[PDB]
Amino acid sequence: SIRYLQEIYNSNNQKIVNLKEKVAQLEAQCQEPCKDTVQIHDITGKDCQDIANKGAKQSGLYFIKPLKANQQFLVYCEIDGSGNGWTVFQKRLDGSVDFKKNWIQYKEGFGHLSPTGTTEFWLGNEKIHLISTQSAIPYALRVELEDWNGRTSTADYAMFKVGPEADKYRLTYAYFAGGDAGDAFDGFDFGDDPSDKFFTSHNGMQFSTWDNDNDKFEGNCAEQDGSGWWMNKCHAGHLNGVYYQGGTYSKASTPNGYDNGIIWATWKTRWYSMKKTTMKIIPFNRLT
């Protein structure tokens, strides 16, 4: 006992010196931050097609900077095995994002961008305008719809163009280029009224939001149906509408009594809301 507490002291006093080193090693091991699964590709260009041409092979997040834009911006590019680079400006798939937004929000964009293309979003109207009119090259718009049974359909529009804010980001195209979803932008003959199809077509319609009414109705379509869209009086195609789980819904499930879901009257009844929606553009010569 005279020299017993001489060792239990120097022995563990040594262990401390050794431990401190293990501690120093743990320190070096905890300097890095959590790894983020989302990353932005390096290649850039005027649009996704320009990016696909430079050799990009993966669908994902890329910055693009159309000629006339004075600042680049992020976008989700869809690049297929044939060198086509689609620039997606709209996506609905689970109802996680509120689409009842104002003029500015629809102008600058809202929602989120994912490398995996699994999120809802609306790129900005300004960006959609900058992309579709950056040069003399005509663009095409592809509408992709999926119902609650796994069936999908498409609608293509040639010479797609969204005007500047001065013209309320007016929607314009030369002609429906086919697709089994049907040309809902050409309006729909819902019933008796003979001015039916006329007032529900979308070509040439300016954009509307509850706070910026630019439709052909004495009322406020955008506010009534809680969305931002190229409203006429009011619509036959409504992809930025209220998301309804299961698709089926009725006038009883709406505050104002109007069909405000994600509809495409030429493919499904206005009381049936899509499960997934995709609005993407690419240079026209790319489909021909």
Binding site: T200, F217, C221, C234, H235, Y258, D259, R270
Partner: peptide, 4 residues
């Protein structure tokens, strides 16, 4: 939809 259409607004009569």
């Amino acid at each position: 939809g259409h607004r009569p």
